[PDB]
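Human: Note token order:
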Amino acid sequence: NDHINLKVAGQDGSVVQFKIKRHTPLSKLMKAYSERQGLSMRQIRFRFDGQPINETDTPAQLEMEDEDTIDVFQQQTGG
């Protein structure tokens, strides 16, 4: 029954938690989050303690234990 409780805080004043294993990439959490929230899979950015992480993350997610907070933001910058 080992699961990581990630509390992602969206810039739109949205607080949502997710329960998953610490042996998989952020692609799962990011997708399930973006898909559940109301975004796209071509414009996302996860901020963890000022460290922009992509959906293809893993090492950092593995380093964690369970109690970790994140901040989902939307920044692309065109031009």
Observations:
- The two ends are 47 Å apart (CA to CA).
- The helical segments are 26-37, 59-63.
- The first helix runs from residue 26 to 37.
- DSSP finds two helices and five strands in the chain.
